[PDB]
């Protein structure tokens, strides 16, 4: 699930699109396949 | 620490053609006034 | 191009941007001005 999540802040006219493949080497696996387990994608101090 | 960048290099599995025979790999960096020497920044055994 | 601390150009100029050992769209990890706490560095003993 590489680079699957991404934040795209929209500025007054512009926008700046950062993807997690550019932040984290840690990937929350779909395993534990057991149901209703949610995952977390932490972003590090996005100096936008 | 100081000025510089984090870099997450992802590498392909072992192929006998592109990697030669030995499965080990070391990745360097330089500045680079090519001929200015490069510093080994990581060594490892590339996976299969 | 700028004095951004985390800004280091992904996929730089005319050079292909690949060793032929990574051969994927995954290089980046270029943001994240911060790394996690180190458990094998100088203060490893105190953290452990």
Question: How far is the first residue's CA from the last residue's CA of chain A?
Answer: 25 Å
* Main sheet strand line-up of chain A: 1-2
- List the total number of helices of chain A: 0
Helicity range of the residues of chain A? Answer: under 10%
Q: Specify the biggest β-sheet of chain A.
A: 2 strands, antiparallel
In terms of DSSP E residues, the strand content of chain A is 15-25%
The coarse silhouette of chain A is: elongated
Tell me how many strands of chain A there are. 2
Q: Largest interface, per-chain counts?
A: B-C, 13 and 16 residues
Oligomer: part of a larger assembly
N-to-C order of helices and strands of chain A: EE
Task: Tell me the structural class of chain A.
Answer: mainly beta
Rg of chain A, nearest Å: 13 Å
Short descriptors:
2 strands, toxin, mainly beta, 3 chains, Insecticidal toxin protein, two-stranded antiparallel ribbon, complex, glycan, 48 residues, part of a larger assembly
In words, what does this structure look like?
- The structure is cut from a larger assembly and holds three copies of chain A (48 residues).
- In chain A, a hairpin with a 4-residue loop joins strand 1 (6-10) and strand 2.
- In chain A, 8% of the residues are buried.
- In chain A, strands 1-2 form a two-stranded antiparallel sheet.
- Chain A has strands at 6-10, 15-19.
- The two termini of chain A are 25 Å apart.
- Chain A has no helices and two strands.
- In chain A, 0% of the residues lie in helices and 21% in strands.
- With 48 residues, chain A is mainly beta.
- The B-C interface holds B 3, 5-12, 18-19, 25, 46 and C 5-6, 8, 20-24, 26-32, 35.
- It is classed as toxin.
- The entry lists the keywords toxin, complex, glycan.
- Morganella morganii TcdA4 in complex with porcine mucosa heparin.
- Chains A, B, C are Insecticidal toxin protein.
- Organism of A, B, C: Morganella morganii.
